[PDB]
Enzyme design. Sequence first.
Site: not given
Lengths: 457, 456
Positions: B77, B152, B176
Amino acid sequence: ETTRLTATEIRARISEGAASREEVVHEHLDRIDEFNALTNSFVELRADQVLEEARAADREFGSTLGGPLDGVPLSIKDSYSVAGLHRTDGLPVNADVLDAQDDVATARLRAAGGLVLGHAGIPDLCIRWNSVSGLYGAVRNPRDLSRTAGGSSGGDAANVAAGFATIGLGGDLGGSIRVPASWCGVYGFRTGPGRIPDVNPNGGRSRNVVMELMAQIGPIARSIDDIELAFRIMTGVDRRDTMSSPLGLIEPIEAPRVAVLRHETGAVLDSSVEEQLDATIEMLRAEGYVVEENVLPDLHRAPEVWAEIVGTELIHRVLPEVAELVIASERMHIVDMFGAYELGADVGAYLTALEERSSIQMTVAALMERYQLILAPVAGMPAPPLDFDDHIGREASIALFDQMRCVPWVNLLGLPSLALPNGIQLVGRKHDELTILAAGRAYERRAPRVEIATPAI
Amino acid sequence: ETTRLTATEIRARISEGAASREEVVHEHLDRIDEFNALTNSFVELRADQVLEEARAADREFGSTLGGPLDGVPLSIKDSYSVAGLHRTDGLPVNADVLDAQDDVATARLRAAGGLVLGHAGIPDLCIRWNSVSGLYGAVRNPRDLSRTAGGSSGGDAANVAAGFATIGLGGDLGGSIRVPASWCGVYGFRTGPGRIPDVNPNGGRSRNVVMELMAQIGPIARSIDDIELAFRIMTGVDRRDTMSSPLGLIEPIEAPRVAVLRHETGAVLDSSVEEQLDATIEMLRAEGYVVEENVLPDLHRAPEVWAEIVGTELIHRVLPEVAELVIASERMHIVDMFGAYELGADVGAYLTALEERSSIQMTVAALMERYQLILAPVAGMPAPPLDFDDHIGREASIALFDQMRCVPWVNLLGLPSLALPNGIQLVGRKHDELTILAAGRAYERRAPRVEIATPA
Ligand SMILES: NNC(=O)c1ccc(O)cc1
Ligand SMILES: NNC(=O)c1ccc(O)cc1
């Protein structure tokens, strides 16, 4: 004369048939009866009940010792539940609160054989460096009755210093263990995150995690062996306390480096305190520790951020609820001192302060990989007069806060710390309690042995 | 072919001499070149540098495997620093933020031989269940390009589901990891307090402890073995993160009882989700677990308290600072949704919410001494359309929140949880990660094998 002795020495007398548990308890209770009118430090006794426990154990065990605290008399802070005692927080409105069960920490001490004599004095709400309550009045320093015993665990420090009990139990959110221990000339050990669970099965009110992260339980005693014994007995997971951990104790680290905190939090220190710090530096060096001065960054914000966070909660949540239930001096201490630092009503300010807390915590954690111990003053002055913080106003309260700036940064960052009888403390990292106690022995091996005080006008 | 395989299977090809690390990396980069225009899930690649790493290992080691992630391509990420890549939080203003060092979690994956291909897509600020940014645009679900990948960690989940990488690394503060993993039909493991340190040596923005207590790092992958492998590699104290602990992993509990969470947090669930929950109950029962329904109390305040605490911070602290830096849909998701729950400006209300958090945590902790695992939906619906949360307004945002009520209570109470590819999760107590993974394996023995999607 068992009132002058450490736990190991008391247990030795019992083991050899030189004293019974009943005799030990009688000696402490007689001493309490003679001098507790002066110190006002044992606020609720269980004399009959503890004598029963002593006699029962004598009948069953004789000179054979049971658990590791068998035969050792204890003082417990009013805040920690003891089955059959009242838990008042100093407030007349709570005089009827009578607990059916021990707290987990108290249960462990008693299960190990500890003989709880009673509950010790405290300030209203346990938010003060002076143990003055509406229900019980003022705890006086057994070393000099004109002086404060400190707080919030002033009663326990006083009981231990006066030889009313061998070991006390307190809590430390803003110095409540370290301040009174040092002012009463005894040891006070603030444990660190995860070790001792705070569990009250009788049902406590429920707390903001931010405050709970800054609070720990710990023993007060006249020797490091007694500190360690009580610490080890109380340590162990209980999943009713979310911050409790099953992590074991970590062995003392080989050759930790020590950083000196002197003025780096902006503290205003008496010459006598600076001289004790100097002496303690040299005790550690003589033991073989590397001790370095002038290595810490400017940390004057650390105690200020503590006061901002705590003060905002006290002024905007706590005081609105309890203002009329606490003594005027408690209310006005909070208004005069924490009123100087509280951030007002805007949540945005409180959130900003919480971010600064994390920033300071990151900085100090990184530097403590290099300096695993910090040597610091506790208070900036020796035990002040009894009324030192009573309706003193804003300006004088800021001056008081400035004298105490070496104390509450420890709470802010969630660190264990051992306060020594000379008013100096050894702060360690999270989980490194045994490293701190090892370093403490550098002091213990060199300083005069702690002796009990005989209170006298 | 290695794009379809799990870490153990890729490593077997290397051991067999059937593939070199360079060939594995090429196969993944070629797949990315072919399909990443559709998913927009890998947002910054380090193709030359990772090929260099693979070739160097091939030369020195040959078919000998080195560390436990040797030969395994990874997605990371954007939020977690990788040396030589940019960390943008999706914001064009941060396009020049180049990191010299890995984050600790990243470093542990790389030190173990993992081959980081690049950074994965995210929403602006990483505050959204839809990975849409100003800098990179929208991540699209590889299983159905009309649908959100979640967020996310939507880029990482999409990368793993598409076979662009074997394992991904995300974070989970309000779902997330779990939301995008489930919506992309892969596994996503939110670890618990103390296990994986969050340390950024480049200088991360400092954060409220309240938020930090609700956030954990963890892996996304196509098998439980790969989840566990990455988990174990990343676990270990780093004292720069004061939340990390030297506590070891705890062996799985013998015979944990499983409580089923269906409507007890007030969630509005699709029939397809209720059916996936029922199916998982039966899978676990068939594997010897005692599973009980209707044993949990009314926990509807749990997701609400999360929204109050998070929302109050986003509205009163975060948005005033970054409002002009984020895409309008990110600003308006915060206002439209969190505006419904935020407590206003009075600090007293926030302090009260914090007290309620502790109360709920204690209640759930007590009941999980009996029910050591909670089985629950993740989202109340399968992956929605890409515009599901785009300028939808207040009423729509409340409806969306109600659909997601089985997700953020886990964060509020600081609990580890494994999201399964069917949109169901297994939640455990603090420190009890291995018990969760054992139950995950029980699901894995009964369920169809996860297969990669080919975006079309
Ligand atoms: N327990 N209480 C403490 O440690 C404490 C002592 C003094 C304070 O101003 C605040 C907290
Ligand atoms: N990392 N971020 C999260 O887990 C998260 C997801 C959705 C939110 O509304 C807020 C936070």
